[PDB]
Short mmCIF file of C-alpha atoms and ligand atoms in Angstrom, two decimals:
data_model
loop_
_atom_site.label_atom_id
_atom_site.label_comp_id
_atom_site.label_asym_id
_atom_site.label_seq_id
_atom_site.Cartn_x
_atom_site.Cartn_y
_atom_site.Cartn_z
CA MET T 1 48.78 -89.95 -19.79
CA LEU T 2 49.04 -88.97 -23.43
CA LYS T 3 51.69 -86.53 -24.66
CA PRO T 4 50.28 -83.39 -26.36
CA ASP T 5 49.89 -83.23 -30.15
CA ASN T 6 52.66 -81.60 -32.22
CA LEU T 7 51.79 -78.24 -33.81
CA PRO T 8 53.56 -76.35 -36.57
CA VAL T 9 52.57 -73.05 -34.93
CA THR T 10 53.13 -71.52 -31.50
CA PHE T 11 49.71 -71.85 -29.90
CA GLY T 12 47.06 -74.52 -29.99
CA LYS T 13 43.28 -74.58 -29.73
CA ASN T 14 43.57 -74.41 -25.92
CA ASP T 15 45.35 -71.04 -25.99
CA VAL T 16 42.29 -69.08 -27.04
CA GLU T 17 38.97 -68.53 -25.28
CA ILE T 18 35.86 -67.86 -27.40
CA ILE T 19 33.91 -65.66 -24.99
CA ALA T 20 30.78 -65.31 -27.13
CA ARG T 21 29.36 -65.70 -30.61
CA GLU T 22 26.52 -63.45 -31.71
CA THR T 23 24.64 -63.47 -34.99
CA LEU T 24 25.03 -60.06 -36.67
CA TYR T 25 22.79 -61.06 -39.54
CA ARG T 26 20.98 -64.32 -40.17
CA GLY T 27 20.22 -65.31 -43.74
CA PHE T 28 20.97 -68.36 -45.84
CA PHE T 29 24.51 -67.87 -44.48
CA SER T 30 24.90 -66.03 -41.18
CA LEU T 31 27.38 -63.25 -40.50
CA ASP T 32 28.55 -63.66 -36.91
CA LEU T 33 30.65 -61.71 -34.44
CA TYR T 34 33.12 -63.68 -32.34
CA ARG T 35 34.31 -62.24 -29.03
CA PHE T 36 37.51 -63.91 -27.84
CA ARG T 37 40.80 -63.62 -25.92
CA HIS T 38 44.01 -65.38 -26.82
CA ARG T 39 47.64 -65.64 -25.76
CA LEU T 40 49.99 -63.17 -27.43
CA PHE T 41 53.44 -64.12 -28.71
CA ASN T 42 54.97 -62.12 -25.86
CA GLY T 43 53.32 -64.45 -23.33
CA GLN T 44 50.56 -62.09 -22.26
CA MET T 45 46.79 -62.38 -22.58
CA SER T 46 45.03 -60.15 -25.11
CA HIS T 47 42.13 -57.77 -24.57
CA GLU T 48 38.79 -58.99 -25.88
CA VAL T 49 39.01 -59.02 -29.68
CA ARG T 50 36.01 -58.84 -32.00
CA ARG T 51 35.83 -60.29 -35.48
CA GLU T 52 32.99 -60.49 -38.01
CA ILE T 53 32.82 -64.02 -39.42
CA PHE T 54 30.89 -65.23 -42.48
CA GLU T 55 29.75 -68.76 -41.53
CA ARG T 56 29.75 -70.33 -44.98
CA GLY T 57 30.14 -74.01 -44.16
CA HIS T 58 31.97 -77.02 -45.56
CA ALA T 59 32.27 -78.08 -49.23
CA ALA T 60 33.31 -81.17 -51.16
CA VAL T 61 35.38 -80.58 -54.31
CA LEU T 62 36.17 -83.23 -56.92
CA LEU T 63 38.77 -83.09 -59.69
CA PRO T 64 37.58 -85.57 -62.38
CA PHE T 65 40.75 -87.08 -63.80
CA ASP T 66 41.08 -89.67 -66.59
CA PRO T 67 44.64 -91.07 -66.10
CA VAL T 68 44.56 -93.13 -69.27
CA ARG T 69 43.73 -90.25 -71.61
CA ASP T 70 45.38 -87.66 -69.35
CA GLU T 71 42.28 -85.49 -69.35
CA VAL T 72 40.25 -83.49 -66.87
CA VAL T 73 36.49 -82.79 -66.92
CA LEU T 74 35.68 -79.18 -66.01
CA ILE T 75 32.23 -77.66 -65.48
CA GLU T 76 31.23 -74.20 -66.64
CA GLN T 77 28.76 -72.31 -64.46
CA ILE T 78 27.95 -68.77 -63.40
CA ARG T 79 29.33 -67.50 -60.05
CA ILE T 80 27.73 -64.07 -59.81
CA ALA T 81 30.08 -62.84 -57.06
CA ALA T 82 32.87 -62.97 -59.68
CA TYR T 83 31.06 -60.35 -61.76
CA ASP T 84 32.80 -57.21 -60.41
CA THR T 85 36.41 -58.41 -60.79
CA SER T 86 36.29 -60.74 -63.82
CA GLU T 87 35.57 -60.42 -67.54
CA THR T 88 32.76 -62.93 -67.25
CA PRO T 89 31.03 -64.45 -64.22
CA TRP T 90 30.96 -67.83 -66.01
CA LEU T 91 33.82 -69.80 -64.55
CA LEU T 92 35.44 -73.11 -65.41
CA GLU T 93 35.32 -75.12 -62.19
CA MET T 94 35.58 -78.44 -60.36
CA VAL T 95 32.64 -80.62 -59.37
CA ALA T 96 31.56 -79.30 -55.95
CA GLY T 97 28.80 -79.35 -53.37
CA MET T 98 28.02 -78.33 -49.81
CA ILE T 99 28.29 -81.03 -47.14
CA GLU T 100 25.49 -81.38 -44.61
CA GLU T 101 24.74 -83.45 -41.49
CA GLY T 102 25.76 -87.08 -41.66
CA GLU T 103 27.38 -86.75 -45.09
CA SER T 104 31.05 -87.41 -45.90
CA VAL T 105 33.18 -85.42 -48.37
CA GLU T 106 33.36 -88.49 -50.59
CA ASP T 107 29.60 -89.12 -50.59
CA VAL T 108 28.92 -85.54 -51.66
CA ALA T 109 31.68 -85.57 -54.31
CA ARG T 110 30.40 -88.77 -55.93
CA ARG T 111 26.83 -87.53 -55.92
CA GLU T 112 27.83 -84.14 -57.39
CA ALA T 113 29.87 -85.85 -60.10
CA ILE T 114 26.64 -87.46 -61.34
CA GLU T 115 24.32 -84.45 -60.85
CA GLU T 116 26.59 -81.74 -62.30
CA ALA T 117 28.67 -83.63 -64.88
CA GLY T 118 26.99 -86.97 -65.57
CA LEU T 119 30.15 -88.79 -64.48
CA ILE T 120 30.43 -91.97 -62.49
CA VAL T 121 33.58 -91.78 -60.41
CA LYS T 122 35.59 -94.93 -59.79
CA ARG T 123 38.45 -94.66 -57.30
CA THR T 124 38.77 -91.39 -55.38
CA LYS T 125 41.79 -90.04 -53.55
CA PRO T 126 42.04 -87.28 -50.90
CA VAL T 127 44.13 -84.38 -52.26
CA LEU T 128 44.02 -81.32 -49.92
CA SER T 129 41.57 -79.47 -47.70
CA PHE T 130 41.87 -75.70 -47.58
CA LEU T 131 40.34 -72.65 -45.92
CA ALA T 132 39.22 -70.34 -48.73
CA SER T 133 39.79 -67.08 -46.81
CA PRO T 134 40.14 -67.68 -43.01
CA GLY T 135 40.49 -63.99 -42.21
CA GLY T 136 36.79 -63.39 -42.78
CA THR T 137 35.06 -66.70 -43.53
CA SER T 138 34.85 -70.16 -41.92
CA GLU T 139 34.52 -71.99 -45.25
CA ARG T 140 36.57 -75.15 -45.61
CA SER T 141 36.83 -77.08 -48.92
CA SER T 142 38.03 -80.68 -49.17
CA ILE T 143 39.42 -81.71 -52.53
CA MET T 144 39.54 -85.28 -53.89
CA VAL T 145 40.62 -86.51 -57.33
CA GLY T 146 38.09 -88.79 -58.93
CA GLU T 147 39.01 -91.49 -61.42
CA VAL T 148 36.76 -91.18 -64.46
CA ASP T 149 36.49 -92.28 -68.08
CA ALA T 150 36.41 -89.03 -70.10
CA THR T 151 34.88 -91.11 -72.92
CA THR T 152 31.61 -91.08 -70.96
CA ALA T 153 31.62 -87.27 -71.03
CA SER T 154 31.32 -84.73 -73.88
CA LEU T 159 22.75 -84.79 -71.09
CA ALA T 160 23.76 -84.54 -67.41
CA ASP T 161 21.17 -83.59 -64.78
CA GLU T 162 21.99 -79.90 -64.34
CA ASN T 163 22.92 -79.46 -68.02
CA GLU T 164 21.14 -76.13 -68.57
CA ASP T 165 22.89 -74.41 -65.63
CA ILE T 166 26.15 -76.40 -65.95
CA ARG T 167 28.12 -77.12 -69.11
CA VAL T 168 30.74 -79.90 -69.17
CA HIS T 169 34.14 -79.46 -70.87
CA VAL T 170 36.62 -82.32 -71.36
CA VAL T 171 40.17 -81.06 -71.88
CA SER T 172 43.74 -82.36 -71.63
CA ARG T 173 45.43 -82.00 -68.25
CA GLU T 174 48.08 -79.87 -69.90
CA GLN T 175 45.47 -77.59 -71.49
CA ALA T 176 43.75 -77.13 -68.14
CA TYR T 177 47.05 -76.33 -66.41
CA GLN T 178 47.92 -73.79 -69.10
CA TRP T 179 44.61 -71.99 -68.52
CA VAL T 180 45.49 -71.67 -64.82
CA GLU T 181 48.85 -70.13 -65.65
CA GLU T 182 47.24 -67.76 -68.14
CA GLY T 183 44.62 -66.83 -65.57
CA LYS T 184 41.75 -68.36 -67.55
CA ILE T 185 40.94 -70.61 -64.59
CA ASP T 186 41.20 -68.55 -61.41
CA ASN T 187 38.85 -69.76 -58.68
CA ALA T 188 40.80 -71.20 -55.71
CA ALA T 189 39.45 -74.78 -55.75
CA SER T 190 40.33 -75.26 -59.43
CA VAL T 191 43.77 -73.62 -59.24
CA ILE T 192 44.81 -75.70 -56.22
CA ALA T 193 43.47 -78.93 -57.70
CA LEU T 194 45.13 -78.41 -61.07
CA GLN T 195 48.47 -77.32 -59.60
CA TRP T 196 48.34 -80.44 -57.43
CA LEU T 197 47.56 -82.56 -60.48
CA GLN T 198 50.41 -80.95 -62.44
CA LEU T 199 52.72 -81.85 -59.56
CA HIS T 200 51.47 -85.42 -59.18
CA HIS T 201 49.97 -86.72 -62.46
CA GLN T 202 52.71 -89.27 -63.17
CA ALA T 203 52.46 -90.94 -59.78
CA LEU T 204 48.64 -90.87 -59.89
CA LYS T 205 48.64 -92.34 -63.39
CA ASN T 206 50.89 -95.19 -62.20
CA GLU T 207 48.86 -95.61 -59.02
CA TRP T 208 45.60 -96.02 -60.91
CA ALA T 209 47.28 -97.94 -63.76
CA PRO X 8 36.00 -72.28 -73.68
CA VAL X 9 33.45 -70.12 -71.83
CA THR X 10 31.19 -68.16 -74.21
CA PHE X 11 28.71 -66.33 -71.97
CA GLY X 12 29.87 -62.87 -70.90
CA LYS X 13 28.45 -59.99 -68.86
CA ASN X 14 25.77 -59.29 -71.50
CA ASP X 15 24.32 -62.76 -70.80
CA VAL X 16 23.53 -61.77 -67.22
CA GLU X 17 20.93 -59.25 -66.14
CA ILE X 18 21.74 -57.85 -62.71
CA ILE X 19 18.34 -56.65 -61.52
CA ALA X 20 19.61 -55.38 -58.19
CA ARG X 21 22.32 -55.50 -55.57
CA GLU X 22 21.05 -54.79 -52.07
CA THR X 23 22.92 -54.33 -48.85
CA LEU X 24 21.68 -56.75 -46.23
CA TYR X 25 24.28 -55.85 -43.62
CA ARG X 26 27.05 -53.28 -43.36
CA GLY X 27 29.72 -53.42 -40.65
CA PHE X 28 33.47 -53.95 -41.01
CA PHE X 29 32.46 -56.15 -43.96
CA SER X 30 29.24 -56.02 -45.92
CA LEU X 31 26.75 -58.69 -46.89
CA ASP X 32 24.96 -58.10 -50.21
CA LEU X 33 22.10 -59.74 -52.04
CA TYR X 34 22.32 -60.17 -55.80
CA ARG X 35 19.02 -60.49 -57.68
CA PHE X 36 19.63 -61.47 -61.29
CA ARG X 37 18.73 -63.54 -64.34
CA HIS X 38 21.36 -65.36 -66.40
CA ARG X 39 21.30 -67.22 -69.69
CA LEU X 40 21.05 -71.01 -69.66
CA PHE X 41 23.01 -73.43 -71.79
CA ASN X 42 19.87 -74.03 -73.84
CA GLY X 43 19.89 -70.34 -74.77
CA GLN X 44 16.98 -69.06 -72.67
CA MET X 45 17.09 -66.69 -69.69
CA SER X 46 16.60 -68.06 -66.18
CA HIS X 47 13.94 -66.98 -63.70
CA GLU X 48 15.17 -64.41 -61.15
CA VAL X 49 17.91 -65.83 -58.93
CA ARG X 50 19.04 -64.58 -55.52
CA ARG X 51 22.44 -65.05 -53.98
CA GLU X 52 23.81 -63.78 -50.70
CA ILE X 53 27.31 -62.35 -51.35
CA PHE X 54 30.00 -61.54 -48.76
CA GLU X 55 31.70 -58.25 -49.75
CA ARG X 56 35.03 -57.76 -47.98
CA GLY X 57 37.24 -56.00 -50.52
CA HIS X 58 40.32 -57.38 -52.29
CA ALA X 59 43.69 -58.59 -51.03
CA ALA X 60 47.33 -58.34 -52.00
CA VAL X 61 49.36 -61.42 -51.06
CA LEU X 62 53.14 -61.66 -50.87
CA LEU X 63 55.22 -64.87 -50.91
CA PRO X 64 58.65 -63.99 -49.42
CA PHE X 65 61.27 -66.07 -51.26
CA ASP X 66 65.06 -66.11 -50.70
CA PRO X 67 66.48 -67.46 -54.02
CA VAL X 68 70.00 -67.74 -52.60
CA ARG X 69 69.08 -69.83 -49.57
CA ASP X 70 66.01 -71.42 -51.20
CA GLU X 71 63.88 -70.55 -48.18
CA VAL X 72 60.43 -69.16 -47.56
CA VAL X 73 59.35 -66.71 -44.89
CA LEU X 74 55.99 -67.61 -43.33
CA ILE X 75 53.99 -65.57 -40.82
CA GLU X 76 51.99 -66.96 -37.91
CA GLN X 77 48.85 -65.30 -36.51
CA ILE X 78 45.46 -66.34 -35.20
CA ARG X 79 42.47 -66.53 -37.56
CA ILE X 80 39.47 -67.28 -35.36
CA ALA X 81 37.29 -68.22 -38.37
CA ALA X 82 39.49 -71.33 -38.73
CA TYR X 83 38.62 -72.42 -35.18
CA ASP X 84 35.60 -74.65 -35.95
CA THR X 85 37.25 -76.67 -38.74
CA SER X 86 40.94 -76.61 -37.88
CA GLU X 87 43.22 -78.22 -35.34
CA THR X 88 44.26 -74.74 -34.25
CA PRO X 89 43.23 -71.14 -35.14
CA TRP X 90 46.89 -70.11 -35.49
CA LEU X 91 47.77 -70.46 -39.15
CA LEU X 92 51.02 -70.36 -41.10
CA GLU X 93 50.43 -67.92 -43.97
CA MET X 94 51.79 -65.51 -46.56
CA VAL X 95 52.09 -61.78 -45.97
CA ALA X 96 48.66 -60.38 -46.90
CA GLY X 97 46.86 -57.09 -46.68
CA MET X 98 43.67 -55.39 -47.73
CA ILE X 99 44.05 -53.15 -50.77
CA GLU X 100 42.68 -49.77 -49.80
CA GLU X 101 41.51 -46.74 -51.76
CA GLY X 102 43.40 -46.71 -55.05
CA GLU X 103 46.49 -48.67 -53.91
CA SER X 104 48.24 -51.06 -56.29
CA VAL X 105 48.73 -54.73 -55.48
CA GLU X 106 52.48 -54.07 -55.32
CA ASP X 107 52.29 -51.10 -52.97
CA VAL X 108 50.08 -53.08 -50.57
CA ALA X 109 52.19 -56.26 -50.78
CA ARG X 110 55.46 -54.38 -50.19
CA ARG X 111 53.98 -52.24 -47.39
CA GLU X 112 52.41 -55.19 -45.57
CA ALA X 113 55.70 -57.13 -45.82
CA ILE X 114 57.37 -54.46 -43.68
CA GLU X 115 54.30 -54.19 -41.43
CA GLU X 116 53.66 -57.91 -40.95
CA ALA X 117 57.15 -59.36 -41.18
CA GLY X 118 59.61 -56.46 -41.12
CA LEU X 119 60.99 -57.58 -44.47
CA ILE X 120 62.24 -55.25 -47.15
CA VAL X 121 61.38 -56.98 -50.42
CA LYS X 122 63.75 -56.47 -53.34
CA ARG X 123 62.59 -57.58 -56.80
CA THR X 124 58.92 -58.61 -57.10
CA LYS X 125 57.01 -60.57 -59.70
CA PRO X 126 53.30 -61.21 -60.19
CA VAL X 127 52.26 -64.84 -59.64
CA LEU X 128 48.51 -65.53 -59.98
CA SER X 129 45.30 -63.70 -59.04
CA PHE X 130 42.40 -65.81 -57.76
CA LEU X 131 38.86 -65.71 -56.44
CA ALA X 132 38.74 -67.39 -53.03
CA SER X 133 35.17 -68.62 -53.38
CA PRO X 134 33.22 -67.09 -56.33
CA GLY X 135 30.10 -68.78 -54.95
CA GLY X 136 29.62 -66.69 -51.83
CA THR X 137 32.19 -63.87 -51.88
CA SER X 138 33.44 -61.27 -54.37
CA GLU X 139 36.96 -61.34 -52.88
CA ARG X 140 39.92 -61.40 -55.23
CA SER X 141 43.46 -62.05 -53.92
CA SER X 142 46.49 -61.13 -56.04
CA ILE X 143 49.71 -62.97 -55.29
CA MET X 144 53.20 -61.68 -55.94
CA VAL X 145 56.50 -63.30 -55.16
CA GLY X 146 59.07 -61.11 -53.47
CA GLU X 147 62.82 -61.60 -53.28
CA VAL X 148 63.96 -61.34 -49.66
CA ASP X 149 67.02 -62.00 -47.53
CA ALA X 150 65.75 -64.71 -45.19
CA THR X 151 68.67 -64.35 -42.76
CA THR X 152 67.20 -61.10 -41.43
CA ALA X 153 63.56 -62.19 -41.17
CA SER X 154 62.61 -62.61 -37.51
CA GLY X 155 60.47 -61.72 -34.50
CA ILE X 156 56.95 -60.47 -33.81
CA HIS X 157 55.35 -57.76 -35.95
CA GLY X 158 52.03 -56.38 -37.13
CA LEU X 159 50.37 -52.98 -36.70
CA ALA X 160 49.57 -51.96 -33.13
CA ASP X 161 46.57 -49.83 -34.15
CA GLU X 162 45.03 -52.80 -35.99
CA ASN X 163 46.08 -55.09 -33.17
CA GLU X 164 48.06 -57.51 -35.35
CA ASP X 165 50.16 -60.02 -33.43
CA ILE X 166 52.30 -61.77 -36.07
CA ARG X 167 55.28 -64.08 -35.64
CA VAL X 168 57.70 -64.86 -38.45
CA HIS X 169 59.00 -68.34 -39.33
CA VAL X 170 61.78 -69.14 -41.82
CA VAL X 171 61.76 -72.60 -43.43
CA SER X 172 63.32 -74.15 -46.54
CA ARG X 173 61.16 -74.07 -49.68
CA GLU X 174 60.93 -77.87 -49.70
CA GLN X 175 59.60 -78.01 -46.13
CA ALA X 176 56.93 -75.37 -46.75
CA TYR X 177 55.88 -77.29 -49.87
CA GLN X 178 55.72 -80.60 -48.00
CA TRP X 179 53.71 -78.93 -45.23
CA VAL X 180 51.21 -77.84 -47.85
CA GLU X 181 50.83 -81.32 -49.35
CA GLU X 182 50.53 -82.54 -45.73
CA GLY X 183 47.82 -80.04 -44.81
CA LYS X 184 49.93 -78.18 -42.24
CA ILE X 185 49.53 -74.99 -44.32
CA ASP X 186 46.04 -74.89 -45.78
CA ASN X 187 44.70 -71.42 -46.35
CA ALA X 188 44.10 -70.86 -50.13
CA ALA X 189 46.60 -68.02 -50.84
CA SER X 190 49.47 -69.95 -49.20
CA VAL X 191 48.60 -73.26 -50.86
CA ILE X 192 48.36 -71.58 -54.30
CA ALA X 193 51.52 -69.50 -53.84
CA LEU X 194 53.57 -72.46 -52.55
CA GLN X 195 52.46 -74.98 -55.18
CA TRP X 196 53.31 -72.29 -57.73
CA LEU X 197 56.74 -71.89 -56.14
CA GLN X 198 57.27 -75.62 -56.22
CA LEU X 199 56.39 -75.64 -59.92
CA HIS X 200 58.58 -72.63 -60.80
CA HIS X 201 61.42 -72.56 -58.25
CA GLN X 202 64.19 -73.56 -60.59
CA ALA X 203 63.28 -70.91 -63.16
CA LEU X 204 62.95 -68.31 -60.42
CA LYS X 205 66.23 -69.18 -58.72
CA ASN X 206 67.84 -69.02 -62.14
CA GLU X 207 66.50 -65.55 -62.67
CA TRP X 208 67.19 -64.05 -59.27
CA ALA X 209 70.03 -66.14 -57.88
N1 ADV G 301 37.06 -60.79 -39.39
C1 ADV G 301 37.40 -59.51 -39.27
N2 ADV G 301 36.50 -58.63 -38.61
C2 ADV G 301 36.97 -57.38 -38.18
N3 ADV G 301 38.20 -56.88 -38.37
C3 ADV G 301 39.02 -57.72 -39.17
C4 ADV G 301 38.71 -59.00 -39.64
N4 ADV G 301 39.81 -59.58 -40.25
C5 ADV G 301 40.76 -58.66 -40.18
N5 ADV G 301 40.32 -57.49 -39.60
C6 ADV G 301 41.11 -56.21 -39.22
O1 ADV G 301 42.16 -55.96 -40.24
C7 ADV G 301 43.52 -56.24 -39.80
C8 ADV G 301 44.15 -57.11 -40.78
O2 ADV G 301 44.63 -56.23 -41.87
P1 ADV G 301 45.19 -56.77 -43.16
O3 ADV G 301 46.46 -57.33 -42.91
O4 ADV G 301 45.33 -55.67 -44.06
C9 ADV G 301 44.12 -57.93 -43.79
P2 ADV G 301 44.11 -59.61 -43.65
O5 ADV G 301 43.47 -59.94 -42.35
O6 ADV G 301 45.47 -60.16 -43.67
O7 ADV G 301 43.16 -60.23 -44.84
C10 ADV G 301 43.90 -60.53 -46.21
C11 ADV G 301 43.74 -62.06 -46.63
O8 ADV G 301 44.27 -63.01 -45.48
C12 ADV G 301 43.13 -63.82 -44.99
O9 ADV G 301 43.21 -65.12 -45.60
C13 ADV G 301 41.83 -63.11 -45.46
O10 ADV G 301 40.86 -64.03 -45.70
C14 ADV G 301 42.19 -62.33 -46.74
O11 ADV G 301 41.92 -63.11 -47.88
C15 ADV G 301 43.37 -56.93 -38.48
O12 ADV G 301 44.42 -56.53 -37.57
C16 ADV G 301 41.92 -56.46 -37.94
O13 ADV G 301 42.07 -55.14 -37.24
CL1 CL G 302 43.57 -81.31 -29.41
MG1 MG G 303 47.32 -59.43 -42.92
MG1 MG G 304 46.42 -53.77 -43.81
MG1 MG G 305 48.21 -56.32 -42.23
#
């Protein structure tokens, strides 16, 4: 038979038992309660543990990058939840969209690039996929870098709710360091780009 | 860059839809459009769970990182395993500073006594559906003493500590073996600033 998969952690998916899932509140996004038992590091089985989980979904995130002009296209839009801990709820972000049945991360990213920023992506490349806050939410965001021509930017579909900004990669990175760009998807994407722009520029050359 | 501020948004109401360990709130508001007019009323369901203090344990002398392992059941449906490799992290309670929480949780979750500490970055995990803000700090630790299982008994935290070189942790992030936001952000930051940090502390 097959050998088991290698894991970087101690226990795998088979070492936990999801006893039950109950909806605590059902709205656009449901807040659920998971009842489960899992192996402890000391070898013993746990009691039943209960956790409230915000079932948010799965998102596609696209970093529009122009390797020739070394620029990034950012979108400005309001994220009301940022109101209580930010100076302004209008954030500079990446192209993004929720992924539904039968859709791929790439399909959503390309479609969002057109709807939100009026950009037509060329080559795309998988970057990273992260869990926004796994202690309380199931959300998972997959990031891809999209090859674009920043000339075609700076009139898009959602132009009254979304404003497009074309800036140098270095300017964008600087804003992250200064804390002027602080939403997870953007920070991760821009740090990744700052760590890999040369190779990506040569790859797409 | 951004020009619209809080005066460009009219929060009509914030209602509590659900209140348990965490709360679920509804925001009813109007916000200005990029054509200058005000939007119709908009509703958004927001997950309110407080704010977090995150600590990246870094040994400048050995160039190693201390990671903690623990199960996060919310990762079950989209991950290969619910047990994640993460940074020390705690919920900031009533009037506690990011530093107090980060240093306290480091003892609690990993039994590490952090020496010098430095702020890193503060981010919003997902401004679209949650108000959560996580503030990351890097803490100087002696990795040769980091070990074993920890976590608070009364909270029922079962946490195991792992010590790996900084390069490995960074490669695991680019490889998707560490993929929770706080850890990814903290480790890419470390990879971008490790030489300057070693120079300062080592
Ligand atoms: N889903 C939940 N429902 C009910 N009780 C819960 C839930 N999550 C955690 N708790 C309770 O809080 C303790 C964790 O305390 P912190 O240690 O004080 C906090 P920590 O878990 O670490 O969260 C900090 C950051 O790490 C994760 O990524 C989170 O998303 C967050 O951004 C757990 O032992 C448990 O008792
Ligand atoms: Cl498997
Ligand atoms: Mg914790
Ligand atoms: Mg705590
Ligand atoms: Mg804790």
